[PDB]
Amino acid sequence: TIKVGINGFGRIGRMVFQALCDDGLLGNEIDVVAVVDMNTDARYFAYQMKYDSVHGKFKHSVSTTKSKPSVAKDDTLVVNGHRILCVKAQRNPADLPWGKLGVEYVIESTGLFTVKSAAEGHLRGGARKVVISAPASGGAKTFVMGVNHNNYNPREQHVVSNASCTTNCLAPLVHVLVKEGFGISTGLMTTVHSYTATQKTVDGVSVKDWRGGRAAALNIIPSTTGAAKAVGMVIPSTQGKLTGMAFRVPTADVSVVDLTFIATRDTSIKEIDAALKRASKTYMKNILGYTDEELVSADFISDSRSSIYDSKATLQNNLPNERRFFKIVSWYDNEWGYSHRVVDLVRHMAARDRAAKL
Amino acid sequence: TIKVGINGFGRIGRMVFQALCDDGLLGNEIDVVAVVDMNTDARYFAYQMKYDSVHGKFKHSVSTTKSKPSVAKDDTLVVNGHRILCVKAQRNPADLPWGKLGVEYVIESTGLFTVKSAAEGHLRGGARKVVISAPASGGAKTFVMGVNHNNYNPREQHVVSNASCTTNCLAPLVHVLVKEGFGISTGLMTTVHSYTATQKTVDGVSVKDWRGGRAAALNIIPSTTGAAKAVGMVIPSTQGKLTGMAFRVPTADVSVVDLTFIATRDTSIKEIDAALKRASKTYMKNILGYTDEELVSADFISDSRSSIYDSKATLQNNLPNERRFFKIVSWYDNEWGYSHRVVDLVRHMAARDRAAKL
Amino acid sequence: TIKVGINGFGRIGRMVFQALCDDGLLGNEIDVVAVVDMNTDARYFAYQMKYDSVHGKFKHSVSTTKSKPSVAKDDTLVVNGHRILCVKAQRNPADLPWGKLGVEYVIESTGLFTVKSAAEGHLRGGARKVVISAPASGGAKTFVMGVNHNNYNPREQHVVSNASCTTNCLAPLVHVLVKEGFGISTGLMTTVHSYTATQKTVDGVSVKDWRGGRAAALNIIPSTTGAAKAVGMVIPSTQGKLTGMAFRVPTADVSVVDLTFIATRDTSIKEIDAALKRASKTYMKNILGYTDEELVSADFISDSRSSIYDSKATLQNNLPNERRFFKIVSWYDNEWGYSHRVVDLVRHMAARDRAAKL
Amino acid sequence: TIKVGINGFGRIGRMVFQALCDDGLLGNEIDVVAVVDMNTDARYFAYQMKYDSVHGKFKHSVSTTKSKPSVAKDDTLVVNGHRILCVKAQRNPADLPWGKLGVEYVIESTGLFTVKSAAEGHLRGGARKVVISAPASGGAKTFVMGVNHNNYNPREQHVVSNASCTTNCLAPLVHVLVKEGFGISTGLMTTVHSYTATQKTVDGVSVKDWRGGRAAALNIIPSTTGAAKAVGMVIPSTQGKLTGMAFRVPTADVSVVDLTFIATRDTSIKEIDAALKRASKTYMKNILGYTDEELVSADFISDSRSSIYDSKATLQNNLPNERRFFKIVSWYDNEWGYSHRVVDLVRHMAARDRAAKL
């Protein structure tokens, strides 16, 4: 993909940078030109980059410098040799130095430009392709790697969406259920979810979501989800046969899916279980994973899979002799894996604008 | 019920004593003679009784003294005027002074005599009726109030069991389903549960449940449950049609039930909603309640209902135009409500041994 | 104080309204005319008023309505019979309808006009007396009740400040030290503090306090404090003899002060203990309290004292035979008590503008 | 040290094993023969060894096998090539197969044999030297590496103590204060401490420490310490000039020291600060560490120093122009570093019974 920019430098924007460093690609394949956020103090950025409450220390050298010598405060990050420019946040993306800086693919991480025309200002700033790191609205095309990232059309798709974190976990499960031919005549899902950057420490103000403003670490907070819905988007086979809800509980990372569906033919949990495990070793490799150990949420932190099927949980917990009525359980680190998928899409698209394959 | 004894004085045994007190029954109707635990320092008991990290300060006067004046340390609780005797914990219940203290109904709260013959040792110490405040085994009778407490037979049942907390929350749900004639042909359930006194603070030893031993306030911990199972005991109609699992999340009290079921004949969530709200006002009154405000877990503390139906959560989150495939959400304060049902059971059983009716 | 207005309706502004209500002063003595925040949906206010994750459910009747019937959504709170007006938040306080609504004492609770000229804009909107519910700057007068509230001068002070919470807890401590004649020649202090509405749930952006931005419920976070500092303002006697720091620990409410000081003339902790317990019963009554039970943080919730002296903790933990080198431990519910002092200050100031004395 | 046994396999016993693996010494220098705990299911042990809620995954291969082929369940751990025997827990250490198994130094981690004669049963089981991983009583000799581990006398000291975790953090600080000649005429200390394996998840039973049985993750719990006291033991210069207390707050690892002392000569914080930093690079190397970044508790997890001096915290927070009255701040991961020190003592002692130096 080579020339890359990053809009909004926190958590995902931070984990996204990090993945492409950890996967050894910075300055051989992907060239992060600049990052942009609510400032340009390059050493806060370096502080944020080295020390993380959940995922741990950065395993790389972080350094700072000034572009030009009339600056006041260092304005460039120098990660493992490479120079990335800190740029000053803008209320409207049209005012980004994209074309000038020499950026062609930009990655959206603010959370303020979900609507497709909004994010489209990046193109107008001389950016060339936009990937919205969340569920976009207004006719942006949604991709879920390993389920439908082959629909990507270099001529058609210009501002795209990489879906949600929960959509990315649910989608790979439904795909092999449909493809190996068990089916979903209908389905319902819960997600037990870690708290995020949009919750408050103490009872706060949330005038659209009343329940969401309440004290984050003191509660279980029922909440809504669009994850299922969007699946229909990515697998149009399944439109309006699925839905769900979310509970937010006081854990700082990692989350899980609880899927209850009715099948299209007579099976057993035993046969589904075996199908899944095997897609792990074949076509869904490195997207879908699986486990048969007795693990807890702590144990998937920094796990770069999109979806990890908990085998004993499922087998242990369905009705015996049943033929259609099944539940499935699947983990996912909501920051880490999704962030990898963001880089995965970016390389794919590039390669495909015949921006050199890999 | 007049003469009562309590075996194991913590959490449940503490909540249970407190219940009958707040419900004003101590010394008019129920007569707590003695309690027993891992000692006989009555002031540690009083300290334990007056201050609680979750439910708050005791609204009653606590006081200690000694039975006879050659004792060493006070051994009688003097609550709001009444004199309860602190009694020394025993490895074997057949060694309790039940007959002698003059105790006839005894409340098992240790967690150590769930097996019917074990818990029968109380009858052997001169005790007369024994309620197990937890799912028993070995042919002890299981009761759920407002669901089947009327099958109680003064002649037949002497060691009985008031189910579990989750069984007491799910049970009334399914009840009015079957009754108002919706049916459950097949059902699956999840409960997101607060942690308990059997988890560990840090990674611990749990050779029976490996996942249970992990650090409790740092994890989501999948776990099993017999709760649905036991429902078919209480409503035989539904034997072998129900099952589910639990998730232990880092909250100290309150929990929630997520039921997903398939109806027996066509309906709409609209009508199921209504039927549930009516049952609240009629036959299931004070057992099952409902809410249509935007409450979170913390809002259910010290709520003495068995099951509380969350209406917005439900209505918001089902499929449109659906006939048979439905999901229901119900809250419950896992300590409190269950402690009140325990008292409710003792009284019923009492009046029924023509131990004077109310 | 009769006519009152409140600026910023959360936590403190919510606790402050609640205080005068529980202390039965709404509509006899104090007259809350209007409140103002980031909107005017009076039912979100009522939802906010009735349910609290820490302090519990409102013991009063909450109700909403509209001022005039061309409004769109209810805009008046109707608490226990009284009609408060919801008023639209303003970037600049000189744009408040103070004069017009007929408001004379206004309570600043936003956290945005600490600078004396800024907070003076209220006088400019027709308001008459302004209390800053947080340490102010720029020559605003600082008061601490039961320590120096008597220096208040109806003619002199118009924009005033009720200190901080920690300043309100430490201050009374040092007071009776100096008075009973022990002296402080030099002192240092730590407070172990609960987290607040300015921390972040996950690793966040805090370019001013770098350590402050880190995940709040996962850390011990050293931090500074001006609390001792401001003490020399309130007791000038001790200027430049005090200082200390804070540690932010993962609890939602309540905090503690750990004072270490050097006396002016010989004594024993035994005598210091006694003097403190007496002051509780005499001149500092209702401000400073004490305890000699084995209470933990949770036991201080909704405790309306300014400072609570932990006697066992202190006596247990000083050097034997020591004359001058001493450590003192005092608790405090950082939200609640301070909200009550704020009301206490308004009344005092009121009566003093001969706004009728109590 | 070569032949080593381990009594009680959790947390320290686990972190102690782990250190000597991580420091590359298993089966070149230290030979762990067997471990012993509340069972002999070698694969739980392997589960406990690989997955840790706080510190992360084991970076090594874990495997299981049976000693002899009539066993029922694997009974040997096979870590990175090496075979360690799982042995069955005993109520009295005299009944350990120490001499037979071929063990000479054993490491005590149960917590049940602190009294010197109790732990001395290991010698009587054919063990040769005992190191109690905690503060022993009854005339065991206490060592604090890098402060007085040179007093060790191969002929005199047979059951020794490696002190406490807090004693290990405090001791290195006082040592360079005394040695560089600033002094301690007197001192007082607080420690803000992570919760441990002896706290309860919910209000529990703790009849010696009432405050310690309360709900661990919901409170700040004042507590007592012997740490200061024991310093006098290790630095007899300082006997009865020091004391302290502990607060336990809801964080699962890492803790910090707050030291307030009066010096023996006129100095400045600037000169102390410089002394410390420099002992880091000289004689106290790898025991005492230091930092001048803006870090929080999460950032020292798995930090193998005994004591880490927070430079900005101290400098930021003392009185200006002061000459005698000072506080110091210092971090420590309570499991990790202390566990390294345990191995450090063991090698030292060995080398010294002329069990071959290094």
Ligand SMILES: NC(=O)c1ccc[n+]([C@@H]2O[C@H](COP(=O)([O-])OP(=O)(O)OC[C@H]3O[C@@H](n4cnc5c(N)ncnc54)[C@H](O)[C@@H]3O)[C@@H](O)[C@H]2O)c1
């Ligand atoms: N963290 C997760 O679990 C997760 C998973 C999948 C998707 N997402 C999505 O990613 C997006 C970001 O989430 P987040 O948690 O990483 O957010 P943060 O972690 O809340 O990131 C937001 C950043 O935007 C910056 N910012 C705000 N306005 C800006 C502007 N005008 N210009 C530049 N920067 C600006 C902020 O300074 C901040 O650093 C969301 O929209 C969310 O839907 C999050």
Ligand SMILES: NC(=O)c1ccc[n+]([C@@H]2O[C@H](COP(=O)([O-])OP(=O)(O)OC[C@H]3O[C@@H](n4cnc5c(N)ncnc54)[C@H](O)[C@@H]3O)[C@@H](O)[C@H]2O)c1
């Ligand atoms: N609070 C809940 O979530 C809940 C709800 C429903 C049922 N229950 C059940 O009730 C039982 C008690 O749980 P708990 O939470 O109160 O446990 P705790 O809260 O762990 O109660 C146990 C008490 O029993 C005492 N004890 C142990 N052995 C004893 C003996 N031989 N004689 C006398 N006292 C003895 C202990 O000292 C302790 O005080 C369990 O079996 C549990 O399944 C709990």
Ligand SMILES: NC(=O)c1ccc[n+]([C@@H]2O[C@H](COP(=O)([O-])OP(=O)(O)OC[C@H]3O[C@@H](n4cnc5c(N)ncnc54)[C@H](O)[C@@H]3O)[C@@H](O)[C@H]2O)c1
């Ligand atoms: N609870 C405590 O620990 C405590 C104790 C003593 C003092 N204080 C102080 O009181 C102040 C408030 O703290 P807080 O905890 O209540 O904050 P919140 O709890 O964060 O309160 C802030 C409220 O102000 C509102 N607001 C913001 N801008 C506004 C505007 N321009 N007009 C009207 N309303 C506006 C916000 O919507 C929000 O509702 C702070 O300055 C703080 O220092 C807090």
Ligand SMILES: NC(=O)c1ccc[n+]([C@@H]2O[C@H](COP(=O)([O-])OP(=O)(O)OC[C@H]3O[C@@H](n4cnc5c(N)ncnc54)[C@H](O)[C@@H]3O)[C@@H](O)[C@H]2O)c1
């Ligand atoms: N974890 C810390 O922060 C820390 C730091 C310094 C010192 N320590 C000390 O280490 C000791 C252990 O603490 P811990 O937290 O690691 O304990 P755990 O983590 O509570 O370890 C105790 C182990 O002892 C085992 N056990 C009990 N009885 C036994 C027996 N008869 N034979 C063999 N094994 C037995 C248990 O199964 C358990 O695994 C304590 O005495 C404490 O003083 C702890």
